[PDB]
Design a protein around this ligand. Sequence first.
Ligand SMILES: O=c1ccn([C@@H]2O[C@H](COP(=O)(O)OP(=O)(O)O[C@H]3O[C@H](CO)[C@H](O)[C@H](O)[C@H]3O)[C@@H](O)[C@H]2O)c(=O)[nH]1
Ligand SMILES: [Mn+2]
Ligand SMILES: [Mn+2]
Length: 283
Amino acid sequence: LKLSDWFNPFKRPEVVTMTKWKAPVVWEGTYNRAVLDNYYAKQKITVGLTVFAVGRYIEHYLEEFLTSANKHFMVGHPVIFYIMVDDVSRMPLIELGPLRSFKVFKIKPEKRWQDISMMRMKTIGEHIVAHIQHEVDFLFCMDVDQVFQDKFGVETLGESVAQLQAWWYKADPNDFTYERRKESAAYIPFGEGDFYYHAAIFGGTPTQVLNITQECFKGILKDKKNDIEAQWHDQSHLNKYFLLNKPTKILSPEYCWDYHIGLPADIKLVKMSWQTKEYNVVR
Ligand SMILES: O=c1ccn([C@@H]2O[C@H](COP(=O)(O)OP(=O)(O)O[C@H]3O[C@H](CO)[C@H](O)[C@H](O)[C@H]3O)[C@@H](O)[C@H]2O)c(=O)[nH]1
Ligand SMILES: [Mn+2]
Ligand SMILES: [Mn+2]
């Protein structure tokens, strides 16, 4: 498969469509999903999707996330949803459609929400080694407080996939909220950086995602050891990781949009949107 076989950057001249290391940035209008569905279907791929719901997030977001995923995620290809919750008795079983199935695991609820978010890196890694590596060809790891709004398909697959954070995609690197303290493993010096990635969505082959999570958790552990916590937790470490190990594909903010921003000309068709945000329950 050649990049030119399914990707035409000339359809979106007003946004960044190719990185300096030749990785494509996928925006609505640049991909030929029909070509990709055929190619991947012929290889009979299976895609995994992990999602964590702890505490109030279960009743507030899990059902909406799973229902929408079942409807819009990798339609036409086998998908396995890996659900991690602290209380399985509340795991909202919904009806899944053709080619979708699931596997639920009960996890420990971390006291601090910051740790609930960060420990995912450890847990995902353990699961990739234990079984996911044998079950799927590609894997995505996502925040639960989001909803699929339209088709999120095979055009998003790749060795290592990153998401452009909706609020900073047009900002210059020196303005990114990377971790700036040299004392943290997530430290990124001013004068460095390609894009500001969103930890709400990342993926790739099981091998690559294993390295992403393992390296991120190592930094998370190193920081705890030195009594320091990155301001943006796992997102900060993920950004450090992606700086050192460039993603082979990046998804535009259309794949992870926050309507609080509005709806600028660049956002042509939203595939997934941030949930309200909260402000009351959840935590
Ligand atoms: O009480 C909680 C808290 C967190 N989470 C899990 O952790 C994820 C990330 O936390 P939030 O959604 O609450 O936080 P943000 O929206 O701020 O997330 C952003 O910041 C985080 C660190 O602050 C991570 O980097 C995350 O991937 C990124 O999208 C949630 O989707 C959820 O799956 C829970 O289940 N229950
Ligand atoms: Mn979130
Ligand atoms: Mn918002």
